[PDB]
Design a protein around this ligand. Structure first.
Ligand SMILES: Cc1nn(C)c(C)c1NC(=O)CC#N
Ligand SMILES: [Cl-]
Ligand SMILES: [Cl-]
Length: 182
């Protein structure tokens, strides 16, 4: 109904279509990416500095750290939106690594449509400090994108890329894409 064919457009990168969206996976350091939104996977206090969160907060800088703690004390948030700081993006969306991953990705997609953004880059949300299983995380991320497309909600969003720290976790995402392909 929705899935295209898996191919490799560039060395180490795998892609397929999900409706109108190009979905891609690759290994590497997410802080070197350019996109309208970069996603951080953090704690419920939005002040973790371990694994991906360490790299993101150190690169983004102290003004983004302060934005995070200020919003955290104002209300109870499931996720927060800050500036990009010194990352190559327009906004960072900080999601809670222990939360339901499908729910978190659905929120990121909706927030990106609200801003008329076209590109998103995310890590393998939940597989660091939160210790969620990589196979369940891959299934949840791709399920969120499928639901978003099925509901007719993709208008501005055109590209969603997962940049993954461990090559062994990339292998799990690749296998899930091959399971789904047309
Ligand atoms: C970038 C990075 N460095 N380290 C040491 C780890 C575990 C990661 N990835 C995550 O934290 C996964 C998620 N979310
Ligand atoms: Cl995590
Ligand atoms: Cl990762």
């Amino acid at each position: 109904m929705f899935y295209g064919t898996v191919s490799s457009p560039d060395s180490g990168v795998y892609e397929m279509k999900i409706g109108s969206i190009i979905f891609q996976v690759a290994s590497g350091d997410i802080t070197k990416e350019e996109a309208d939104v970069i996603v951080n996977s953090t704690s419920n206090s939005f002040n973790l500095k371990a694994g991906v969160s360490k790299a993101i907060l150190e690169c983004a800088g102290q003004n983004v750290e302060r934005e995070c703690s200020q919003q955290a004390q104002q209300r109870k948030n499931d996720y927060i939106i800050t500036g990009g700081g010194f990352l190559r993006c327009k906004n960072i969306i900080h999601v809670i690594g222990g939360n339901d991953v499908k729910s978190s990705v659905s929120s990121v997609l909706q927030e990106c449509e609200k801003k008329n953004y076209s590109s998103i880059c995310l890590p393998a949300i939940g597989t660091g400090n939160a210790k969620q299983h990589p196979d369940k995380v891959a299934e949840a991320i791709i399920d969120a994108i499928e639901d978003f497309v099925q509901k007719g909600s993709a208008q501005s969003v055109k590209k969603v890329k997962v940049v993954i720290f461990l090559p062994q976790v990339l292998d799990v995402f690749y296998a899930n894409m091959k399971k789904r392909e047309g």
